[PDB]
Amino acid sequence: AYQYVNVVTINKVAVIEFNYGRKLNALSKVFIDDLMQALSDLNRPEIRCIILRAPSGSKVFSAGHDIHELPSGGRDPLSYDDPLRQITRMIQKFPKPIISMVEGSVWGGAFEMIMSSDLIIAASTSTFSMTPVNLGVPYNLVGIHNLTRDAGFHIVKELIFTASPITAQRALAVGILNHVVEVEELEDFTLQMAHHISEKAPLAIAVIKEELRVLGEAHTMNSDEFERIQGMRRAVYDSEDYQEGMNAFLEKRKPNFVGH
Amino acid sequence: AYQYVNVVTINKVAVIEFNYGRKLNALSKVFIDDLMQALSDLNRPEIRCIILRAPSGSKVFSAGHDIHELPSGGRDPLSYDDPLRQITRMIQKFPKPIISMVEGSVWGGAFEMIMSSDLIIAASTSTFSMTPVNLGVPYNLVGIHNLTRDAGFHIVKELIFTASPITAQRALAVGILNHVVEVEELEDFTLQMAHHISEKAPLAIAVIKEELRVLGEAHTMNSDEFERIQGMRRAVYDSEDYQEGMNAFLEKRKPNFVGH
Amino acid sequence: AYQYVNVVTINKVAVIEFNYGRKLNALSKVFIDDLMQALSDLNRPEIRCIILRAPSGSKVFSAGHDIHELPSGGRDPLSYDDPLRQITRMIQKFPKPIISMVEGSVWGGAFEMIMSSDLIIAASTSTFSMTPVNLGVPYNLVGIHNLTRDAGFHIVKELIFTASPITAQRALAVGILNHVVEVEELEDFTLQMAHHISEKAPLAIAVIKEELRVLGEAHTMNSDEFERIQGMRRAVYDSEDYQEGMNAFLEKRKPNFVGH
Amino acid sequence: AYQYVNVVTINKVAVIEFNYGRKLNALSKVFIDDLMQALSDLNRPEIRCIILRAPSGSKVFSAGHDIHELPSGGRDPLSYDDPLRQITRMIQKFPKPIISMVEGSVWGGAFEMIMSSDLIIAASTSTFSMTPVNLGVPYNLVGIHNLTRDAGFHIVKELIFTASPITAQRALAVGILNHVVEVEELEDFTLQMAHHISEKAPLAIAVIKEELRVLGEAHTMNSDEFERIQGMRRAVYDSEDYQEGMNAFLEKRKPNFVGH
Amino acid sequence: AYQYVNVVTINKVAVIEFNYGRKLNALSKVFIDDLMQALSDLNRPEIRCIILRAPSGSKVFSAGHDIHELPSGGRDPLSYDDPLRQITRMIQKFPKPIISMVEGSVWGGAFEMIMSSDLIIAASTSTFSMTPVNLGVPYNLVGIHNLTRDAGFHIVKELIFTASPITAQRALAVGILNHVVEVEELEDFTLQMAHHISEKAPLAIAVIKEELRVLGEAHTMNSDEFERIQGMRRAVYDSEDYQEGMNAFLEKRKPNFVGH
Amino acid sequence: AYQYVNVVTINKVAVIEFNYGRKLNALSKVFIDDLMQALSDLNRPEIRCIILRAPSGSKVFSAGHDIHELPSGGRDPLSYDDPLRQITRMIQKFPKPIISMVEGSVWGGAFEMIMSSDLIIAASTSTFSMTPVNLGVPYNLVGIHNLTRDAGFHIVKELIFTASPITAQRALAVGILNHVVEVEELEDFTLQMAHHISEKAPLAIAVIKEELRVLGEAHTMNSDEFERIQGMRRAVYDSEDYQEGMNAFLEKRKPNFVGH
Ligand SMILES: C[C@@H](C(=O)NCCNC(=O)CCNC(=O)[C@H](O)C(C)(C)COP(=O)(O)OP(=O)(O)OC[C@H]1O[C@@H](n2cnc3c(N)ncnc32)[C@H](O)[C@@H]1OP(=O)(O)O)S(=O)(=O)O
Ligand SMILES: C[C@@H](C(=O)NCCNC(=O)CCNC(=O)[C@H](O)C(C)(C)COP(=O)(O)OP(=O)(O)OC[C@H]1O[C@@H](n2cnc3c(N)ncnc32)[C@H](O)[C@@H]1OP(=O)(O)O)S(=O)(=O)O
Ligand SMILES: C[C@@H](C(=O)NCCNC(=O)CCNC(=O)[C@H](O)C(C)(C)COP(=O)(O)OP(=O)(O)OC[C@H]1O[C@@H](n2cnc3c(N)ncnc32)[C@H](O)[C@@H]1OP(=O)(O)O)S(=O)(=O)O
Ligand SMILES: C[C@@H](C(=O)NCCNC(=O)CCNC(=O)[C@H](O)C(C)(C)COP(=O)(O)OP(=O)(O)OC[C@H]1O[C@@H](n2cnc3c(N)ncnc32)[C@H](O)[C@@H]1OP(=O)(O)O)S(=O)(=O)O
Ligand SMILES: C[C@@H](C(=O)NCCNC(=O)CCNC(=O)[C@H](O)C(C)(C)COP(=O)(O)OP(=O)(O)OC[C@H]1O[C@@H](n2cnc3c(N)ncnc32)[C@H](O)[C@@H]1OP(=O)(O)O)S(=O)(=O)O
Ligand SMILES: C[C@@H](C(=O)NCCNC(=O)CCNC(=O)[C@H](O)C(C)(C)COP(=O)(O)OP(=O)(O)OC[C@H]1O[C@@H](n2cnc3c(N)ncnc32)[C@H](O)[C@@H]1OP(=O)(O)O)S(=O)(=O)O
Ligand code: NI
Ligand code: NI
């Protein structure tokens, strides 16, 4: 029923499995359109819990935002109706829990996507990287905020400023992951927890989830502060460095950033 | 001088011990009113630190809200002057440190109560559960907010959406607990910390505790957002699921939740 | 060049070494003025990352706020223009990452200073304490807020109410520190990470740092609540206890606090 | 095409005329559902400006909330999905200007409804009253806020505390109305302005309307404050006085309020 | 029963008449303490509306803050527990409408006091001046906020930057006053309105006043911004100019301000 | 001296007169850069009050934003460092009162500019229009906020949705202006007020001006609401209507807006 995802229903749990292996489940507009369609189709009282996953044995869970779909320069790369912006809002507003079940490496926007979900259960061999400083991308306020609700600020700044992968074991220690399991146990450990959640009161889960969403968003600022940040972001997406970051990825080389 | 608590004073440290074991120290109106009177009576310059505890050897620290006293009549069960709501505000505004010293199992409202205190020191055998999804209860914004200042969002959502107990060891790992001690060392570990705090400057403690309280509360939202959440909560406490949750608990059977 | 700091530039990384061992790198105005000038002078495109350190082998990283300079004539000791308040603003607003590379003991205002920095890498023998309750100091809102973005509320309250030192191992476990290494590896580990950061896109680093700063600050309150807190702080810095704390420190004796 | 409104379209201007004169255009659920359906049907690119009006010659523009549909005792009479609450939100979110063109007397909820619209043009004989204090109604935060964006606090508190009618001339003087015109010129004057607005850029109008909506709503408070206000409101809608106010209106007698 | 006020109650209305004309009803601690005790004594269910007035034929309604009680030698003149700050909070939180019935001239803190009240009815010969720039006083955030809810910013800035008296006619036109009437009608007009308000639902009045109070207060800012403003205010109350403003007032001469 | 403004000092008052009559004082980058330099040059203790004026006899006070300098499409026209955005911040943060003394017609950005000033004194023949809906411009949040602190919402929505001029008399009536005077009296009346202000306490004026600025900006919102607004603004500046509005102005014809 979808080109880019496969949905299986097990009792009251729906498992949405990525089927975009040819672009390593990059969050291209058409992939995200199918994932959002599949979530919408599952917004029914007989479904009580969602699992997001890559196919069994995947080396790459998701390669993150489709770098080819980023603008060439002079345009905001992460505007409100960008597909990554759409899917994080939809996950956060969805009235059922969404568990990210992670096998393989997770990159950039895909790391934000799983951080926006309710629980993360990961393989012992999974790895996690936050990548805008590799490309010169001015990440947006909402996107950064979605990275700050689990690990502390020092941990988050190390992840973003180094863009270095962290292990599942370190991700568990700093509070990013709920559980780390051997890859052979991942699917059944995650399904056991999803089935348990599915026996609980779904209207209580939905309103508690919404209350947590609203409290998590409730860091408020005045208009001048937001427009000041937007002007800083524009200077970045106008920079030579942003174009060097895009070109280095296209030419498969290490970018040379100079600070303009 | 109280029916439902025993108070011992050791120089500048006051220990408030639950005396409601008949009802597993459930947070009934008469128990909370005594606990609040005892705290009020200890608000004197000669007292510098409070310890809350269950009696030595308790299997159950507190069974949480008295489910007989939960409003069933399409009436908000966690309104501003509900005893649980009163005691958390009082604990948080109290100008001395309050340490929860936990032996036995902690449930629901009693988990929110210890989370509202300043430090938690627990026995290695103690266990912790947050239970509103078991009953279909739409936990209130302030109450949920009180669960979000220690562990991360993914961890909080696991605790609430599963309603599964966690060990003291996991509660320490995720940042809920300050210390975990062998049961036979719990009382003297907690007392030595309370005596030590009692040597420090009480006016500096009080103003710093109050500054943390107001920074912790300073997640702000507009009226529309609050009224929208209140409407969602009312749809939950009006639901058939909420009735089924209450009735199943009291009739000692598994509830059948349907999403209405 | 600078009287009170030494700067070594290695490729794109600047290492700022404290040179105030006379007062164990206490935050005297003359020392902070030199540190802020040295930071300002490093705000140039060819510098990509800063390390702050005490001299190799230091027993004391920083002894904290200069207690001789703390106002005890009954004015606010932590007003907006105080050296500690100035250096934390400058570190947070600095468009390059600032890593605190810690060897030795860290006290009070120096603990707030490293908490305000982006990443903290510490020696396994380093120790950390937050000390206002030893002196009767009413720590200000911004300074307390700077302590709340890494460890949870319960842990922060234990640190502040006890003013007890914690080990590097505990500071890592509770999420204050990024990494703990053997002293012999501290320069190698820290420089490797700083050089790595220095290959990344500096304009993306700067805007994301600023986004995190403004999100971190975005706990808002009304004027009445601020003026109320300021009145409570005044009552503390006018107290007999505050004079007793200051005198006790200068006379190298134990303060006796009485709650006025 | 509607039972309770009549819609006329003149180029880019739509006039929605009430057709509920046998209940004096009271804001009953059936009337408001037709009004909201008519607005939704007009959310089309070629419609640029809406006028809301009562029929020509109306003595009563609207008698406000249907007092027979106000919750009798114990339920919030002004919950998020109450019809008055739904229509003010829809008017304010609607991406085209909505002009209230007022002939006759305006009461209670209907006064809040025209205040929620973008412009008010009124007959010289029109009158305005805000009536919750006649009935003992605890008007909700969003609804009170909707009355505060035109005239000052003192003038708003006079209107609500007295429940006395003001003339169109006073309503113009204090900043509630845009224009006052003789009743024979009201339709022509309002249509000329609507046609003129309709020549302007609709996407600029829509985004500026939405910017004003969000700035108007951006009075934020913490969860405890909202829950405290909700507890005060519940005490009022649980009061003897609230029952007495409803009873007195329906028995056409002077209420006897006693402050419980 | 009071030295500095006279209270008369008829039916459900109380009139608090100032009795401190030998000091032109200056807001000395002893006068504010009596006014607050009189209002506290009237917080009874049978009292439903308060009027504040000067005696019949007063030239000076209130000469404002007693300049003799303004702190010199570097304390904040408008700290949270200053009598003017206490009375404005008490009026705003008082669960009954408070009408200011004004005959004569209104100065400085007394202008803030009447602005904090619910309605102002004034004689046609009344005059109003806001005076901090006369004395070099850094008016506090709450106090300035209390002046912004009636007239627009440009008008408020004219009143403050000029310190020039405005007529009752102009005060009515700009939205500061509810009504202006000839002196001989002032008491009859105000009593008619107070007695009319006292027949309305008191619990509805109280909750709506409190909702307006919290919405009015709900302009929120971060800790840094409040601390930055406080540093600015301290520099002013530490200034040459502030000492010169007070000295000039008490020596009955014109200050020479120099901007230090 | 300046190419595009003329500055006169009279005692402690500085008058900045526009000298760009060949472009009807349009807010070009070269003009704004000169006005800002002149303002910065006058930030001196011997200057107490600023007046902004057009030359005596001007038909046009300012034609507003230089339409030639708006970016053609796909670019935000009112970014943080746009000249209009810069000048309004600088006027608002300027520690001396700035009085707009208006002869002639005021358009668009020039209307936002005088609104951002402290007081407006205008000739009886002056006229005022706010014009973004003539051109299809998505005005920014800060810009709109600057139009909301004087007149009420219904009045501001009329001015913006119609783009029709208002007279000085109506602008006085709705709270936009301080004073309207005959053109022959304008200069003398404005100078007398400016000289009067110049004898008051400048430090008190500066801190109260800054308090008002921050209270004025203190309408706060979460990141998502800001980014949702920016997405809407970008849909407008990407629109065919935006291109049509600019092309119509250039080609001197009536635009044909279609809603995309
Ligand atoms: C902008 C935001 C964002 O999400 N950016 C994307 C962040 N993602 C990344 O940085 C991952 C970039 N890719 C990689 O590091 C490697 O391709 C990955 C994931 C490790 C796996 O390496 P492999 O050697 O197995 O495969 P290989 O290098 O040959 O690539 C296979 C084909 O897929 C392509 N590819 C990979 N990632 C992306 C992507 N994110 N967007 C678009 N295309 C992608 C890659 O270029 C290659 O294409 P072909 O050469 O045409 O076959 S931000 O950075 O968070 O701000
Ligand atoms: C509503 C909020 C809240 O705090 N709800 C309450 C959450 N509390 C719980 O879920 C704990 C429920 N109870 C249990 O799990 C077990 O009773 C525990 C506490 C482990 C005790 O086990 P035991 O085997 O020793 O005793 P047993 O199950 O036989 O129960 C003995 C009698 O105590 C009763 N009881 C227990 N808890 C409560 C309660 N919270 N309110 C009212 N009654 C309670 C239980 O019904 C039984 O009563 P009898 O039938 O008279 O023997 S919320 O959920 O957080 O939103
Ligand atoms: C107010 C905020 C704050 O930052 N308070 C300060 C917190 N700092 C402290 O508690 C550390 C106090 N210092 C010490 O305990 C000792 O100096 C420690 C670190 C244990 C090291 O002992 P030593 O015997 O090795 O060194 P010694 O005591 O002789 O000091 C060397 C010279 O520097 C001086 N010194 C030290 N600390 C400070 C300080 N915080 N402020 C001002 N001066 C300090 C110390 O007095 C000595 O100077 P001389 O006696 O003149 O040689 S708050 O508390 O966070 O609110
Ligand atoms: C909850 C909010 C709200 O909007 N409350 C309702 C506010 N509306 C009012 O207070 C209007 C009350 N009614 C009146 O003042 C008069 O009925 C009105 C509008 C002036 C016109 O008087 P008339 O002489 O032409 O007709 P008359 O008074 O005899 O009543 C005709 C029949 O209609 C009825 N009626 C009127 N208004 C309402 C209403 N809002 N809800 C329900 N019924 C209403 C009135 O009771 C009478 O009924 P019958 O005697 O059976 O024919 S609140 O108050 O703002 O909080
Ligand atoms: C500090 C805040 C505040 O509320 N400041 C106070 C603002 N109040 C004023 O500026 C009013 C100052 N006073 C005057 O303008 C005149 O005294 C007024 C009130 C018009 C009355 O004129 P009169 O000719 O009838 O009486 P006269 O000028 O000779 O003074 C009578 C005696 O009372 C004294 N007086 C007056 N006002 C105050 C005051 N606010 N605090 C302390 N004393 C005051 C005045 O100095 C004179 O004193 P003696 O000659 O010693 O009997 S602030 O400025 O808003 O921030
Ligand atoms: C975008 C923001 C903004 O500030 N927009 C600009 C708003 N300003 C306007 O709409 C005013 C546009 N101009 C007019 O209304 C009239 O040109 C004005 C002030 C009344 C004077 O008309 P007159 O008949 O007296 O003289 P006339 O029109 O013949 O002289 C016109 C020459 O000057 C030019 N002009 C005028 N205004 C501007 C402007 N704002 N930017 C650029 N050029 C302008 C106009 O195009 C014409 O040029 P030439 O005749 O070709 O030399 S927004 O709209 O607030 O968002
Ligand atoms: Ni927060
Ligand atoms: Ni406001």
The residue type at D34? D
The secondary structure of residue A65, as a DSSP letter, is B
Number of compact structural domains in chain A: 2
Q: Is the domain of C110 the same as that of C177? A: yes
The residue type at F61? F
Q: Is residue D193 part of a domain?
A: no
Asked whether residue A231 is marked as a ligand-binding residue, the answer is: no
Taking the centre of ligand 8 as the mean of its atom positions, its distance from the CA of residue E216, in whole angstroms, is 7
Task: Please name the chains neighbouring A, where neighbouring means 3+ C-beta pairs under 8 angstroms.
Answer: B, C, D, E, F
Read off φ and ψ for residue D58, nearest 5 degrees: -60, 130
Experimentally, the structure was elucidated by X-ray
β B60-62/A166-167 pair status: unpaired
* DSSP track, C14-35: EEEEE--GGGTT---HHHHHHH
Detail the DSSP E strand segments found in chain C: 5-10, 13-18, 49-53, 60-62, 98-102, 105-107, 119-123, 127-129, 166-167, 179-181, 221-222
State the Cα–Cα distance between residues A105 and A131, nearest whole angstrom: 12
Give the distance between the most distant pair of CA atoms in chain C: 56
Residue keyed to tokens 């100035």: C86
Of F112, F104, F31, nearest to F61 by C-alpha is F104
Read off φ and ψ for residue C49, nearest 5 degrees: -160, 145
Q: How many other CB atoms are there within 10 angstroms of residue B176's CB atom?
A: 24
Q: Which of C133, C158, C219 sits opposite B204 (nearest CB)?
A: C133
Contact E223 C218 (CB under 8 A): no
State the Cα–Cα distance between residues B104 and C169, nearest whole angstrom: 28
Give the distance between the most distant pair of CA atoms in chain E: 56
Q: Is the domain of A2 the same as that of A88? A: yes
The secondary structure of residue C73, as a DSSP letter, is S
**Resolution rounded to one decimal, in angstroms:** 1.8
SS3 label, residue A98: strand
Q: Is the domain of C172 the same as that of C250? A: no
Of D226, F93, B150, nearest to C151 by C-alpha is B150
- Which candidate in A109, A136, A143, A245 is catalytic? A109
Q: How many other CB atoms are there within 10 angstroms of residue B168's CB atom?
A: 22
Taking contacts as CB-CB distances below 8 angstroms, the residues of chain A near B245 are 201, 204
Q: Is residue B190 part of a domain?
A: no
The residue type at A124? S
State the Cα–Cα distance between residues C141 and D232, nearest whole angstrom: 30
Contacts of A131 (CB under 8 A, 6+ apart): A64, A107, A108, A111, A163
Query: Residue D148, class by beta-carbon neighbours within 10 Å (0-12 exposed, 13-18 middle, 19+ buried)?
Result: buried
Q: Which residue, of C184, C216, C236, is where some domain finishes?
A: C184
Residue keyed to tokens 């209009």: F84
Give the Å distances, CA to CA, from D8 to A58, D33, D34: 60, 18, 15
CA R_g for chain C:
18
Q: Is residue D189 part of a domain?
A: no
Read off φ and ψ for residue B231, nearest 5 degrees: -60, -40
β D127-129/D166-167 pair status: antiparallel
Of E89, E2, E106, nearest to E53 by C-alpha is E106
The residue in chain F having the minimum alpha-carbon distance to the alpha carbon of residue A88 is F224
Q: Which of A215, A220, A223 sits opposite D220 (nearest CB)?
A: A220
E37–chain F nearest CA distance, Å: 32
Query: Residue E82, class by beta-carbon neighbours within 10 Å (0-12 exposed, 13-18 middle, 19+ buried)?
Result: buried
State the Cα–Cα distance between residues A190 and A187, nearest whole angstrom: 5
Give the distance between the most distant pair of CA atoms in chain A: 56
Contacts of C139 (CB under 8 A, 6+ apart): B204, B207, B208, B211, C78, C132, C160
* Cα A167 from chain centroid (whole Å): 17
Read off φ and ψ for residue C138, nearest 5 degrees: -85, 90
* The three-state (H, E, C) secondary structure of chain F, written as one string: CCCCEEEEEECCEEEEEECCHHHCCCECHHHHHHHHHHHHHCCCCCCCEEEEECCCCCCEEECCECHHHCCCCCCCCCCCCCHHHHHHHHHHHCCCCEEEEECCEEECHHHHHHHHCCEEEEECCCEEECCHHHHCCCCCHHHHHCCCCCCCHHHHHHHHHHCCCEEHHHHHHCCCCCEEECHHHHHHHHHHHHHHHCCCCHHHHHHHHHHHHHHHHCCCECHHHHHHHHHHHHHHHCCHHHHHHHHHHHCCCCCCCCCC
Read off φ and ψ for residue A120, nearest 5 degrees: -130, 120
CATH no. for residue E14?
3.90.226.10
Q: How many other CB atoms are there within 10 angstroms of residue F188's CB atom?
A: 9
Which residue lies with its CA nearest to atom 14 of ligand 2? B63
F139 lines ligand 6 (CB under 6 A): yes
Q: Is the domain of A147 the same as that of A225? A: no
Long-range contacts of A172-177 (CB under 8 A, 24+ apart): A172/A122, A174/A150, A174/C175, A175/A150, A175/A151, A175/B151, A175/B152, A175/B154, A175/B155, A175/B174, A175/B175, A175/C175, A176/A115, A176/A120, A176/A128, A176/A150, A176/A151, A176/B152, A176/B154, A177/A120, A177/A121, A177/A122, A177/B154
Give the Å distances, CA to CA, from C110 to C176, F111, F118: 14, 50, 43
Residue to mutate among A230, A236, A238, with most F CBs inside 10 A, is A230
β F127-129/F105-107 pair status: parallel
Q: Is E65 noted as a catalytic residue in this protein? A: yes
**Structure tokens belonging to residue F175:** 């709270």
Asked whether residue B109 is marked as a ligand-binding residue, the answer is: yes
Q: Is the domain of C121 the same as that of C69? A: yes
Q: Is residue F189 part of a domain?
A: no
C-beta separation of E216 from E149 below 8 A: yes
C-beta separation of A97 from A132 below 8 A: no
Residues of C taking part in catalysis: 65, 109, 139
Q: Which conformational region is residue A259 in: left (phi greater than 0), alpha (psi within -120 to 50 degrees), or beta?
A: left
Q: Is the domain of F110 the same as that of F11? A: yes
C-beta separation of E34 from E83 below 8 A: no
Q: What angle do CA A58, A59, A60 make, to 5 degrees?
A: 90
Q: Is residue C196 part of a domain?
A: no
Residue keyed to tokens 């000395």: E28
Q: Which of E215, E220, E223 sits opposite B220 (nearest CB)?
A: E220
Give the Å distances, CA to CA, from C178 to A130, A171, C29, C190: 16, 12, 29, 11
Asked whether residue C64 is marked as a ligand-binding residue, the answer is: yes
Residues E20-42, buried b or exposed e (16+ Cβ, 10 A)? beebbbbbbeebbbbbbebbeeb
Q: Is residue E190 part of a domain?
A: no
CA atoms within 13 A on the CB side of F183: 13
Q: Is the domain of E50 the same as that of E76? A: yes
**Structure tokens belonging to residue C80:** 């907006």
Q: Is residue B195 part of a domain?
A: no
Read off φ and ψ for residue D151, nearest 5 degrees: -90, 160
Give the Å distances, CA to CA, from E158 to B143, E177, F198: 46, 17, 13
Query: Residue A164, class by beta-carbon neighbours within 10 Å (0-12 exposed, 13-18 middle, 19+ buried)?
Result: middle
Sheet with strand C13-18: strands edge to edge: C5-10, C13-18, C49-53, C98-102, C119-123, C179-181
Q: Is residue C197 part of a domain?
A: no
The secondary structure of residue C69, as a DSSP letter, is T
Q: Is the domain of D157 the same as that of D250? A: no
The residue type at D68? H
- Residues after which a C–N gap over 2.5 Å breaks chain D: none
The residue in chain C having the minimum alpha-carbon distance to the alpha carbon of residue E219 is C222
Task: Give the helix/strand (H/E) hosting B181.
Answer: strand B179-181
Contact E80 C230 (CB under 8 A): yes
C-beta separation of A113 from A67 below 8 A: no
Contact D217 B223 (CB under 8 A): yes
Q: Which residue, of E153, E184, E215, is where some domain finishes?
A: E184
State the Cα–Cα distance between residues C239 and D75, nearest whole angstrom: 50
Pocket probe mutation, ligand 6, options F30, F67, F162, F241, max atoms within 8 Å of Cβ: F67
Q: Is the domain of C14 the same as that of C99? A: yes
Give the Å distances, CA to CA, from B110 to B14, B88, B100, B101, B149: 20, 10, 11, 12, 16
Q: How many other CB atoms are there within 10 angstroms of residue E196's CB atom?
A: 15
β F5-10/F13-18 pair status: antiparallel
- Rounded to the nearest 10°, the torsion over CA E82, E87, E88, E93 is 130
* The three-state (H, E, C) secondary structure of chain D, written as one string: CCCCEEEEEECCEEEEEECCHHHCCCCCHHHHHHHHHHHHHCCCCCCCEEEEECCCCCCEEECCCCHHHCCCCCCCCCCCCCHHHHHHHHHHHCCCCEEEEECCEEECHHHHHHHHCCEEEEECCCEEECCHHHHCCCCCHHHHHCCCCCCCHHHHHHHHHHCCCEEHHHHHHCCCCCEEECHHHHHHHHHHHHHHHCCCCHHHHHHHHHHHHHHHHCCCECHHHHHHHHHHHHHHHCCHHHHHHHHHHHCCCCCCCCCC
* DSSP track, A125-169: T-EEE--HHHHT----HHHHHTTSSSS-HHHHHHHHHH---EEHH
Q: Is the domain of C206 the same as that of C179? A: no
Q: Is A109 noted as a catalytic residue in this protein? A: yes
**Structure tokens belonging to residue D95:** 């991406």
C-beta separation of D1 from D42 below 8 A: no
Q: How many other CB atoms are there within 10 angstroms of residue E43's CB atom?
A: 12
State the Cα–Cα distance between residues E28 and B82, nearest whole angstrom: 42
CA R_g for chain F:
18
Query: Residue C175, class by beta-carbon neighbours within 10 Å (0-12 exposed, 13-18 middle, 19+ buried)?
Result: buried
Sheet with strand D98-102: strands edge to edge: D5-10, D13-18, D49-53, D98-102, D119-123, D179-181
Which residue lies with its CA nearest to atom 28 of ligand 4? D252
Give the Å distances, CA to CA, from C197 to A181, B60, E200, F82: 31, 51, 68, 33
CATH no. for residue E250?
1.10.12.10
Q: Which domain holds residue D236?
A: 202-260
Of B111, B104, B87, nearest to B38 by C-alpha is B87
Sheet with strand A105-107: strands edge to edge: A60-62, A105-107, A127-129, A166-167
State the Cα–Cα distance between residues D86 and D89, nearest whole angstrom: 5
The residue type at A57? G
Tell me the torsion sign for CA atoms C2, C6, C9, C13.
negative
Q: Is the domain of A80 the same as that of A152? A: yes
State the Cα–Cα distance between residues F165 and F18, nearest whole angstrom: 22
State the Cα–Cα distance between residues C57 and C59, nearest whole angstrom: 6
Give the Å distances, CA to CA, from D162 to B252, D130, D131, D243, E44: 55, 9, 8, 20, 20
* Cα C15 from chain centroid (whole Å): 17
Q: How many other CB atoms are there within 10 angstroms of residue B190's CB atom?
A: 25
Contacts of A86 (CB under 8 A, 6+ apart): A32, A36
Taking the centre of ligand 1 as the mean of its atom positions, its distance from the CA of residue A148, in whole angstroms, is 24
The residue in chain C having the minimum alpha-carbon distance to the alpha carbon of residue A235 is C203
C-beta separation of D96 from D53 below 8 A: no
Q: Is the domain of B123 the same as that of B209? A: no
State the Cα–Cα distance between residues E232 and E236, nearest whole angstrom: 7
**Structure tokens belonging to residue A229:** 């940040």
Task: Give the helix/strand (H/E) hosting B7.
Answer: strand B5-10
State the Cα–Cα distance between residues F181 and F185, nearest whole angstrom: 6
State the Cα–Cα distance between residues C162 and A141, nearest whole angstrom: 36
**Structure tokens belonging to residue A243:** 């174009």
Tell me the torsion sign for CA atoms D177, D182, D186, D190.
negative
SS3 label, residue C103: coil
Q: Which residue, of E133, E155, E184, is where some domain finishes?
A: E184
